[PDB]
Amino acid sequence: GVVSALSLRERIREHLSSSVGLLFSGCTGINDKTLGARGGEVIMVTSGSGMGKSTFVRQQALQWGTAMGKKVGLAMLQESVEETAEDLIGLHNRVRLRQSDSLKREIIENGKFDQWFDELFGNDTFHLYDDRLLAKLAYMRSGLGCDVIILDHISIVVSASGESDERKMIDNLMTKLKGFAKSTGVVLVVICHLKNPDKGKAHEEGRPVSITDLRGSGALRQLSDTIIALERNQMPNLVLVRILKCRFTGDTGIAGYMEYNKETGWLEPSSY
Amino acid sequence: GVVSALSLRERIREHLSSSVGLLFSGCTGINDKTLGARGGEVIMVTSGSGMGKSTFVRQQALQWGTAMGKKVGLAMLQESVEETAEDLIGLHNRVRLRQSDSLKREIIENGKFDQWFDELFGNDTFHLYDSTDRLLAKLAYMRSGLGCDVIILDHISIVVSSDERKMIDNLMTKLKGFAKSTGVVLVVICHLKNPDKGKAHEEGRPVSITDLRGSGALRQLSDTIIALERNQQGDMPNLVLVRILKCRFTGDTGIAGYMEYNKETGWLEPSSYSG
Amino acid sequence: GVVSALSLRERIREHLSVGLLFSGCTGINDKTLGARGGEVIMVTSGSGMGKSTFVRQQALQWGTAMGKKVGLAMLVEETAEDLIGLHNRVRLRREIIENGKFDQWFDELFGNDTFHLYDSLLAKLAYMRSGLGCDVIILDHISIVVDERKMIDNLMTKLKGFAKSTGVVLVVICHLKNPDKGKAHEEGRPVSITDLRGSGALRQLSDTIIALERNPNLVLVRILKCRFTGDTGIAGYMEYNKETGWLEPSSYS
Amino acid sequence: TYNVWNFGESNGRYSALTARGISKETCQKAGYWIAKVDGVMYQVADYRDQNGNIVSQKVRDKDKNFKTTGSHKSDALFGKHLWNGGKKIVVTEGEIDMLTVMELQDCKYPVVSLGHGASAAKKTCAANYEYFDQFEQIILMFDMDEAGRKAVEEAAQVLPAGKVRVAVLPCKDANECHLNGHDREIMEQVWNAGPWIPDGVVSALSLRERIREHLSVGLLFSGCGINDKTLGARGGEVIMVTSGSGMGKSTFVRQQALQWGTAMGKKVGLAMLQESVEETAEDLIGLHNRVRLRQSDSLKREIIKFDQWFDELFGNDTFHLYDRLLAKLAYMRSGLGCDVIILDHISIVRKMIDNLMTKLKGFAKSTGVVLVVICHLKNPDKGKAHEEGRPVSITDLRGSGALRQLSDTIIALERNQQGDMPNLVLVRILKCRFTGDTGIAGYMEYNKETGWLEPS
Amino acid sequence: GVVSALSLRERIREHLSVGLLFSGCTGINDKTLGARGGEVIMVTSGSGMGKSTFVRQQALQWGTAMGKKVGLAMLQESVEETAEDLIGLHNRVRLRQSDSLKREIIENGKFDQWFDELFGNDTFHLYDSTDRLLAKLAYMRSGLGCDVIILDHISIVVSRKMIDNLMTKLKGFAKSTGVVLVVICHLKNPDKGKAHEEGRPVSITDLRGSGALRQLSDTIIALERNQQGDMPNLVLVRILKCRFTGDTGIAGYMEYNKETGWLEPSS
Ligand SMILES: Cc1cn([C@H]2C[C@H](O)[C@@H](COP(=O)(O)OP(=O)(O)OP(=O)(O)O)O2)c(=O)[nH]c1=O
Ligand SMILES: Cc1cn([C@H]2C[C@H](O)[C@@H](COP(=O)(O)OP(=O)(O)OP(=O)(O)O)O2)c(=O)[nH]c1=O
Ligand SMILES: Cc1cn([C@H]2C[C@H](O)[C@@H](COP(=O)(O)OP(=O)(O)OP(=O)(O)O)O2)c(=O)[nH]c1=O
Ligand SMILES: Cc1cn([C@H]2C[C@H](O)[C@@H](COP(=O)(O)OP(=O)(O)OP(=O)(O)O)O2)c(=O)[nH]c1=O
Ligand SMILES: [Mg+2]
Ligand SMILES: [Mg+2]
Ligand SMILES: [Mg+2]
Ligand SMILES: [Mg+2]
């Protein structure tokens, strides 16, 4: 039932003995402000429509799954497992494998595909996926032992189910997912979208995004710990990062600037 | 089921050499920054009211049917079966079959009407539709039971006609799930909403991405977005502009290239207009 | 419902083996080629600026000249008195009840029983089309029939579905919205395609958009949308008669 | 109930019908016979499918009971197996009518019948659309009742169009006209009938004399316009007065009740449920003598000449006040001879409102009395309220929606209550079955000193 | 069950024979005259505008200087986080947001010296996460004798009538037991104009769920600050309703003092 504050010395001693860390990549001001992703938090990544909300998260997954040895689970629902495991092969070798038939035919010919495959998927650090979703996430946490779970494109788990009221279903899914992340203590990266503005320019042409532009409900900004927003204009490759809310620390605002390399596919830091 | 990282050795190897893009016709500036169309691709086509969506999609269907041998299925709800059959037969013979009563009277009295009919539909690639939930079942029967590769849906606002936003979101989700794990190009024709200030879309206004009417869930589940424009009150009423608004595979947006519509043959050809 | 390509061996030949011209201004047939089966013709004008006269003249010229049954859902005896006063070239709006020539005017119009009226919705129109056997159906004042955006879109969807696979010419009269800057519609402002009030689905399901404009009595007919040919602009000029009610075609520059 | 009754196990015998008027040949051709089981003679009719197999029995006794032998299908017609085409069929309501038509036509025309009647005609006529394609004309022969007219009206949607005609009869059905010797008038109704014309489709040929009738009143209304548009009140009409709370429904209907008892001289039966009986009489006394009574303390005790003002307007037996309710209103119609019945509030009286409105409609159809019923409006979900000048639509009817499907005219009032002046009402006619025209009727002012709604 | 007014002298004499002050700005104690027994207090702000920080400072000032029994209910988070936050806030050192200092005091041996300074008594009590919440609050009120009960999040209690029934039940509990009760709720999504995070003045309409959240509570305190502005730490405190005093409006101003963590007043 209730817990007295006097018989709590051992738990407070063992809690701060350990976690903290798990830095980001691509930019410096994100780790300056947000100080990385933590266990139990829910980090929400927002962009426009086709503005680079899936390249950034897969680049972060490639950084976290290789350079730190953390077991990473990916619930990709936009594309199948044949494409989201193909881009990680090309991005590690600094090429664009899916967008060139010549390199595909060359790595079929010379036998370099096995050398690119065993150099990445040697350790069990990537677990993919193709009420029937949260049980699979609980199985990934318990039976498999993942440390970073990426939930992609939340707009097709609240619209693909038949409900008379959408907003209450979004609120119930969000509080159940937050309870799962708080109970198991796993790092969770959730991707959502934005809604239509009323006047002025569009989000795909350089609109300064606010916090109330989250599409679907009003509890997406009330049960999340870090809100990262990506903005660019279509220089058609100068993307900037805005930290809209952080529960842990206080400083919010413009983190920095990044640029997208068109020949390799990375997010390099820029100066401006 | 949850898959692992070691069982993906053979399936990625098979998928790597399975995938082949289908080229576009009419303009060469589109293929330079879209790279065609593959399995699990949704191509949204939009313009103003009466700007030439149906003509462009019908030309694309004809060039994918009579040249590359791809099995094409249509779901024309804007018209019926005989009208679009006459449109295809007239368009392949470089004439306008509906706009000439004398030509319709002539080609039936000289016995050559079987010459035009047996050269297109004799290779039985085309499969038409004779006009929610049963529409998806009929499209699934058209895909699995017949083996088509391109499926065209025209004027989606009939299908969504309580609350339109949840219906069009569930419809777009069902069509994206139907395109996923099946391997079929899905072309969807939609329209635009009313403008707020200034000139209209039928007089030559540049369109944004937030003008697709009905909801905002149309540009969030589409893989390629193509917009056509022309001016019917200016000097050149047959000079169109093609604008790629969103490309999730390549990432190049903007003006592809101008084209010119022929009033006598029904075709529209690649022009050489400069801005 | 799935129909293959080899099943249309003789249905296309049956479909090849239909035009209904417009009276008054002869320029309108020069660019839209009349009408055909499954043709929705949206006719609009200003606030009482030649709004219910042109459609009535086209109904009268289609009824007694080509033998086409014309069903008017005008929104009963008033339109009959107006047609009798219009065909005999008099300004109705006393003598004919005395000398007995009212029966002579009645026996020459409705004696070939083509016309049908509506008593002051879609099942009645389906009975009028299938049971009675008409070809032209006219609806006026669709703002009276119809949140004023979901109803009008479903109404246009049901009317387009009724006109499909039936072979009927459906003429629909609508209104225009109020202007904001410059000059009004009653002074001779050139109309745009986005002036149809109520929704934006009116020009996405119609097959012909005809607009009428006037100020002293010279009217202007403008084609705004044609899905058969694609020619827009001014189709001609007509002049209204203040003594007979018959607006006549002119040759104004 | 048990099994299909064989004639060997039930002593079947084919005989005639003397008391009904059917010989033995018609029942022999159809299959109608009589069994002797359980002592009492049981009459029985046979049903056959399209092939001709025995599929159903209909067992009736001398006391008009029903006994279906098993699974009764919906596509089984009495007289269907014998005919498989033709150019003219005659659809009856019962089974003895089909035998009567076969007797009076010498077994020539293809004549069928229904197996359910006027209660389930829609179920047996909707699923039988594929059988009616091989026919050229259909002649409907229903009863001269209310249920027969309801069946022939609701059977207009499931039958093919342009082929079905409806005939009329002076009897209940064809059998009493067969018994009363009207064998020369039924053949003219079979050969000649009338088209449908359902409720909105008026052909131009049928205006030979209606335009001349247009080129040629009832109980009038007080205050401007209304009687010029709806042509007054008639017998059997159900007048509805709908407005917002505080818009003056009771004052308007009380002024209409006063001018129908002092000028027309008709017996008016009041029924006030919103207030007591000691207040509406004082309000009528104050309304007649041009001086407001219930809103002045000194004049209520100054006149107490009270008996003079009492018997000036209550000197006759004109008005009848009131302090389950349908028996009261039936006594007010019959036992008192009243012409006007006013019901002030209906919500204090889903399934309750519909049954009450059907019962009041049947009462007003049987008696033929002027009936005024007052109800309220809904609550609008967006915009201004009905009290600041929003026009009342026909959709906003408080309770079950069917208050407009069983009425005859609807009068609404609008005035700006919190505005520049509250004493200028707008009268709107929403629906008139006879005249047809709707819209704004006129404008009245209240004249706060007196209480009369004089026109302006 | 009715009680006449004449035989009520003894119950009026024993009833009337200021209250718990707030901390921070001095205007909030001057305007609504502090908290009283039996009240229901609402604290409103935008998303991440300092709801838990202000009420945690209030619990620290009411649990140490006054010595009253304070019962926290952190349904939003765990108990180790709020325990470490209280230990850091009492010692004026930002503890949870510093990595090089959490491992410093665990080896020095002065961690228990900071622990027994505020948890030496049996004062604080914590909740560990539909109808069991009211039974646990009744247990905290009876079996422990708590004076101020703080409820951190009302929206996750909701799995319109379920909010009205819950608020009537909480008002009946706080009226029968006579306990001071603070309940935290959120604001709704606006439709036109700026957001609440960029310095929009909060109206009394903006309350999620239903509209009876402003009808049963006794006082409403809103906090506003400009997040994307010239300074992000100057907050404004707005009193929206007070049944006892009546005066509402802008109370005062507080700055955050980023290094320490105390909402100290400004001018
Ligand atoms: C980040 C970025 C991407 N791109 C291009 C390359 C990418 O392949 C393409 C989109 O890749 P994605 O990362 O898949 O785009 P998305 O996730 O935002 O799409 P959606 O919102 O529909 O889910 O955009 C740029 O051109 N400039 C950029 O700065
Ligand atoms: C392509 C093109 C067509 N046309 C003409 C010829 C076509 O027969 C006519 C209409 O072509 P459609 O393609 O049928 O018009 P639409 O589909 O855009 O209209 P809706 O929204 O109602 O479905 O337009 C031009 O005038 N200029 C052009 O550039
Ligand atoms: C119509 C009208 C009424 N009045 C007065 C007459 C009445 O004394 C008072 C209210 O009118 P009433 O007729 O008494 O209202 P009501 O009882 O019919 O309403 P409901 O049954 O729905 O509750 O207002 C005016 O002063 N000016 C006016 O224009
Ligand atoms: C009050 C205040 C807090 N902060 C920062 C520093 C604190 O560590 C951080 C804590 O935020 P919280 O107080 O936990 O935010 P919240 O409770 O209002 O919102 P929610 O629980 O719904 O997410 O806020 C400021 O930067 N400036 C301020 O004025
Ligand atoms: Mg994506
Ligand atoms: Mg089209
Ligand atoms: Mg009243
Ligand atoms: Mg909080």
Swiss-Prot record, chain A:
Site (dTTP/dATP binding): 96, 193, 232, 247, 260
Residues of the full protein shown: 264 to 547 of 566
Species annotation: Escherichia phage T7 (Bacteriophage T7)
Protein name, per record: DNA helicase/primase
Binding site for ATP: 47-54
SF4 helicase domain boundaries: 18-272
Domain notes: The N-terminus zinc finger domain is essential for delivering the primed DNA template to the DNA polymerase. The central core domain contains the primase activity. The C-terminus region is responsible for the helicase activity and binds 1 Mg(2+)-dTTP.
Free-text function comment from the UniProt entry: ATP-dependent DNA helicase and primase essential for viral DNA replication and recombination. The helicase moves 5' -> 3' on the lagging strand template, unwinding the DNA duplex ahead of the leading strand polymerase at the replication fork and generating ssDNA for both leading and lagging strand synthesis. ATP or dTTP hydrolysis propels each helicase domain to translocate 2 nt per step sequentially along DNA. Mediates strand transfer when a joint molecule is available and participates in recombinational DNA repair through its role in strand exchange.
Quaternary structure and partners: Homohexamer. Assembles as a hexamer onto linear or circular ssDNA in the presence of ATP or dTTP. Present in a mixture of heptamers and hexamers in the absence of DNA. Interacts (via C-terminus) with the viral DNA polymerase that is bound to DNA; this interaction is essential to initiate leading-strand DNA synthesis. The priming complex consists of 2 DNA polymerases and 1 helicase-primase hexamer that assemble on the DNA template. Interacts with the single-stranded DNA-binding protein.
Phylogenetic classification of the source organism: Viruses, Duplodnaviria, Heunggongvirae, Uroviricota, Caudoviricetes
From Swiss-Prot, chain D:
Residues the record marks as site: dTTP/dATP binding: 292, 376, 415, 433, 446
Top-level taxon of origin: Viruses
Cofactor note: Binds 2 Mg(2+), one of which is catalytic.
Record: residues binding Mg(2+) 2: 173
Membership in a protein family: Belongs to the Teseptimavirus DNA helicase/primase family.
Domain notes: The N-terminus zinc finger domain is essential for delivering the primed DNA template to the DNA polymerase. The central core domain contains the primase activity. The C-terminus region is responsible for the helicase activity and binds 1 Mg(2+)-dTTP.
Function: ATP-dependent DNA helicase and primase essential for viral DNA replication and recombination. The helicase moves 5' -> 3' on the lagging strand template, unwinding the DNA duplex ahead of the leading strand polymerase at the replication fork and generating ssDNA for both leading and lagging strand synthesis. ATP or dTTP hydrolysis propels each helicase domain to translocate 2 nt per step sequentially along DNA. Mediates strand transfer when a joint molecule is available and participates in recombinational DNA repair through its role in strand exchange.
Name by which UniProt lists this protein: DNA helicase/primase
Naturally occurring in which organism (per UniProt): Escherichia phage T7 (Bacteriophage T7)
Higher taxonomy: Viruses, Duplodnaviria, Heunggongvirae, Uroviricota, Caudoviricetes
Coverage span on the entire protein: 65 to 545 of 566
